[PDB]
């Protein structure tokens, strides 16, 4: 480019060097010898630029595994639990939820007796976090909640971006 | 219960129970009947993409779910801008969209800004800035987010020959699984206790450029005549 070249050639001249942009041609004015010098500089700064093809390769391989299993216990008549936080949901919220889900009856004698169905919102709140097998085995009012899961994950990713650039030039992609 | 699946058995069974018709009795002998709402069941089913089938056997309701999502996309757009040598040209087919900062007008779309200069014969040098954008909703973000793929480089192309500026080749395989574990290991009955979610994505982008040098008027008339 004339603009780059005129700047460079100022020093060689030290004569006037003026860059005509639209034609990309530069106007030299000097004596004969300096002219023959700057034409030999321009001749060697005018060379063709090779151009590189930059091809990146990105490899991201993830893998994951886990096994979460344990047995919990509970008795809500006299509240006694064997309870764990490792598990998805704890026996406390599960038994409480199951009791709230039962149909409750409210009696007023003298002989009114009303019946009403309970909400599942506590049980729904307890089960929403379960990833796995949560199985309640009720034996003699002791409800043992078994929970077990194996989460096996994997990921494989190749993306390679290639940008083609003139030498010494910069490229964004 | 599994999270890989569209909807989990918990919300589905809860929804089905809420949908049943409930009766409320007060004896002495009043008995009222009322129909339940579907809003929980509707909230559970809204996310299902696929087959979700509830097989009720002995109060144990097994919810099977299976789907195969096969997608494809194919896009060619080529924008050509005709320029005087050493002159610069912008080209945009797209839209100006405002963006907070206050606010400002930013252009998104297919845009090509090129500044050629011609080797005194044949090869053309190109300072090129090329973008393909579009507006995406902000989730969640303070303002809309532009999907933008651009490359701005400097290449030297022969007169009438094509040259590849850029590209991307992307491939993904995401497998996921859940199981009891032990029961899900059995070959025949294992598929009853497993939830598998597999996905394969693939993408290709090439950006090519073909200059053509117009010197005579008969060349410009020859090109304009065929594009016309």
């Amino acid at each position: 480019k004339a603009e780059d070249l005129v700047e460079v050639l100022k020093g060689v001249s030290e004569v006037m060097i003026a860059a005509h942009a639209d034609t990309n041609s530069l106007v030299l004015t000097a004596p004969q010898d300096i002219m023959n010098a700057m034409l030999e500089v321009i001749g060697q700064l005018d060379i063709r630029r090779a151009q590189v093809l930059i091809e990146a390769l990105i490899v991201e391989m993830a893998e994951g595994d886990g096994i979460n299993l344990g047995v919990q216990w509970g008795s809500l008549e006299s509240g006694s639990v064997i309870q764990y936080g490792n598990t998805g949901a704890s026996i406390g919220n599960v038994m409480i939820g199951l009791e709230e889900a039962k149909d409750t009856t409210q009696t007023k004698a003298v002989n009114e007796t009303t019946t009403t169905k309970g909400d599942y919102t506590k049980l729904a709140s307890a089960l929403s976090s379960i990833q796995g097998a949560a199985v309640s085995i009720a034996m003699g009012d002791w409800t043992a909640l078994i929970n077990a899961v194996s989460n096996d994950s994997s990921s494989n990713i190749l993306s390679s971006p290639s940008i083609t650039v003139m030498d010494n030039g910069e490229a964004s992609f | 219960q599994y999270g890989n699946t569209g909807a989990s058995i918990g919300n589905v069974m809860i929804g089905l129970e809420e949908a049943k018709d409930t009766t409320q009795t007060k004896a002495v002998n009043e008995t009222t009947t009322t129909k339940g709402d579907y809003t929980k069941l509707a909230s559970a089913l809204s996310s299902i993409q696929g087959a979700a089938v509830s097989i009720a056997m002995g109060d144990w309701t097994a919810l099977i779910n299976a789907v195969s999502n096969d997608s494809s996309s194919n896009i060619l757009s080529s924008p050509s801008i005709t320029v005087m040598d050493n002159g610069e040209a912008s080209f945009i087919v797209g839209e100006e969209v405002p963006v907070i900062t206050t606010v400002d007008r930013k252009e998104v779309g297919i845009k090509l800004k090129v500044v050629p200069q011609i080797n005194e014969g044949n090869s053309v040098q190109l300072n090129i800035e090329q973008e393909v954008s579009n507006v995406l909703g902000a989730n969640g973000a303070v303002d809309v987010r532009f999907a933008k793929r651009q490359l701005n480089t400097s290449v030297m192309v022969q007169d009438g020959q094509m040259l590849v500026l850029g590209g991307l080749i992307d491939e993904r395989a995401l497998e996921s699984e859940s199981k009891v574990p032990l029961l899900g290991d059995i070959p025949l009955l294992g598929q009853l206790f497993r939830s598998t979610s597999s996905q394969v994505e693939k993408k290709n982008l090439m950006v090519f450029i073909k200059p053509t040098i117009i010197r005579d008027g008969v060349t410009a008339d020859g090109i304009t005549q065929r594009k016309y």
Partner: protein, 46 residues
């Protein structure tokens, strides 16, 4: 070759629900890009 070995092992026990040719695997060192097996098969016909 370490990663390529990992990926070949990923291709031996593959995606259970999908075809094992869909898992990305690096080409053998220095060979650049290869068409899929099915696509490659198609190309030879034409």
């Amino acid at each position: 070759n370490y990663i390529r070995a990992e990926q070949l092992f990923r291709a031996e026990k593959g995606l259970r629900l999908l075809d094992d040719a869909s898992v990305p695997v690096l080409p053998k060192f220095g060979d650049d890009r290869r068409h899929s097996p099915e696509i490659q098969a198609f190309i030879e016909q034409m």
